[PDB]
Design an enzyme around this catalytic site. Structure first.
Site, short mmCIF file in Angstrom:
data_model
loop_
_atom_site.label_atom_id
_atom_site.label_comp_id
_atom_site.label_asym_id
_atom_site.label_seq_id
_atom_site.Cartn_x
_atom_site.Cartn_y
_atom_site.Cartn_z
N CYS A 1 4.64 65.13 14.11
CA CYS A 1 5.87 64.57 14.65
C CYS A 1 5.85 63.07 14.37
O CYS A 1 5.24 62.28 15.12
CB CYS A 1 6.01 64.85 16.15
SG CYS A 1 7.51 64.14 16.90
N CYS B 1 7.35 60.92 17.28
CA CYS B 1 6.75 60.89 18.65
C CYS B 1 5.52 61.76 18.86
O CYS B 1 4.41 61.24 18.66
CB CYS B 1 7.80 61.06 19.77
SG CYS B 1 8.75 62.64 19.61
N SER B 2 5.66 63.03 19.24
CA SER B 2 4.47 63.80 19.62
C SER B 2 4.71 65.31 19.73
O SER B 2 3.86 66.06 20.21
CB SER B 2 3.92 63.27 20.95
OG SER B 2 4.90 63.37 21.96
N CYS B 3 5.88 65.74 19.26
CA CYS B 3 6.40 67.11 19.45
C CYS B 3 5.41 68.11 18.92
O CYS B 3 4.91 67.93 17.79
CB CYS B 3 7.79 67.21 18.83
SG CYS B 3 8.83 65.81 19.46
#
Ligand SMILES: [Co+3]
Lengths: 201, 219
Positions: free
Chosen positions: A106, A109-111
């Site tokens: 991602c 971000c961090s998905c």
């Protein structure tokens, strides 16, 4: 040479106090229930993690009908083993093959697919992995000890929307007649992100 | 927003260091911060798109230096003030202005069912799909100051629609009180050469990105 921006840098010295202050505030106002919060923490500490995904993979390896359902509808597929919910509402399973190696990231971000892999590790959410995976995947994978053949295609999936990806790694050679449980033990977290391969017996 | 969070293609971040045997939570305070998110979302205090854009708006050095859950802590301290849920003073002092005025929506009885269910961004109806798999598309060159999910590294580039996922909420509008404006989301495949040029690329490699219908035009 300290950690600065790789996800493992040291937090501020007063961080625990700041956190406690906010928590007390939100509890006092009636915005959050600490008992419910404890259940959330227990869920991600003890109940949800990569052993879930590993069961999914092991079942797909032994059961071609299940594999087919799983690739057709990831969410329904993982729900067959009781996995579902937050950050896995719309799952897409990525089949590795001799011609294609899949890996996801991602960049924004961090998905990450919580219901099958649990919360992501700090490196996945940090700038080194996020910045470089879409531009030089081979260089990144090499840092993990994984060298993809030059003729094998690498597909990097950037998780920019609300689909969540998990990699269905290839079954290791020499695992004839293994039970689902023995196969599941080979399936590492990295093998389901695409940053590693399953353990070879 | 062309901010420091849009990392794809950046240089200078260095090796991917990974902690051996990393626990889910590396510090106790992280457990508190992590568990606050579902609690506050359950209240409807903000939506996830607003949450993401709040992180995007933090100071760039702060974003870089902060460990992951420090980013979340920042959102709680700031977005809750922007939304009118807390005041600046309450946040500074850690002291409520006037007692238990709310009731938590996330209670022990519903935690399991809520976490097992989540909240899909898929929607039944929205704008018609303009593209079919196989179509060549170009990502529009847009540079909004607000929230968007088209990474800078894709803008102006040409790729192939490889999956139509159906209809989803649009984050660009949902993050800014302009409604959901649901539309199709596609996975679009880009060659390494298209994204990074002849030198910085490998002939075999492809990058797939999920992009909303109106992020695109026919190639
Ligand atoms: Co993310």
């Amino acid at each position: 040479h300290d950690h600065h921006h790789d996800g493992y840098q040291a937090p501020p010295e007063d961080i625990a106090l700041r956190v406690k202050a906010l928590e007390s505030l939100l509890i006092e106002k009636g915005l959050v229930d600490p008992a419910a919060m404890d259940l959330v923490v227990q869920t991600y500490e003890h109940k949800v993690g990569p052993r879930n995904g590993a069961k999914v993979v092991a079942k797909a390896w032994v059961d071609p009908a299940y594999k087919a359902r799983l690739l057709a509808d990831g969410t329904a597929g993982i729900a067959e083993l009781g996995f579902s919910g937050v950050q896995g509402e719309d799952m897409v399973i990525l089949e590795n093959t001799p011609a294609v190696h899949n890996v996801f990231v991602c960049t924004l971000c961090s998905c990450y697919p919580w219901p099958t892999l649990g919360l992501p590790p700090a490196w996945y959410k940090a700038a080194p992995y996020r910045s470089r995976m879409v531009s030089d995947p081979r260089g990144v994978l090499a840092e993990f000890g994984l060298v993809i053949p030059a003729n094998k295609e690498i597909r990097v999936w950037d998780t920019t929307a609300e689909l969540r990806y998990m990699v269905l790694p290839e079954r290791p050679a020499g695992t004839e007649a293994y039970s689902e449980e023995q196969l599941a033990e080979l399936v590492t977290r990295d093998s389901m992100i695409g940053t590693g391969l399953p353990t070879q017996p | 927003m062309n901010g420091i969070h849009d990392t794809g293609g950046a240089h200078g971040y260095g090796p991917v260091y990974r902690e051996p045997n990393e626990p889910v939570f590396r510090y106790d305070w992280e457990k508190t911060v992590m568990s606050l998110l579902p609690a506050l979302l359950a209240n409807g205090n903000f939506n996830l798109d607003e949450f993401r854009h709040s992180i995007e708006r933090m100071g760039p050095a702060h974003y870089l230096e902060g460990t992951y859950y420090e980013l979340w802590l920042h959102v709680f301290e700031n977005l809750l003030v922007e939304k009118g849920v807390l005041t600046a003073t309450e946040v500074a002092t850690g002291k409520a202005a006037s007692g238990k005025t709310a009731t938590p929506v996330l209670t022990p009885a519903i935690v399991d069912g809520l976490l097992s269910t989540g909240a899909s961004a898929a929607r039944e109806e929205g704008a018609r799909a303009r593209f079919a798999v196989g179509d060549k598309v170009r990502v529009l060159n847009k540079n909004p100051v607000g929230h968007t999910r088209m990474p800078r590294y894709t803008r102006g580039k040409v790729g192939t629609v490889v999956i139509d996922h159906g209809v989803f909420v649009t984050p660009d509008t949902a993050a800014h009180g302009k409604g959901e404006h649901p539309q199709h989301v596609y996975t679009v495949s880009f060659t390494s050469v298209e994204l990074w040029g002849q030198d910085a690329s490998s002939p075999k490699d492809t990058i797939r990105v999920d992009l909303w219908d109106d992020y695109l035009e026919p190639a």
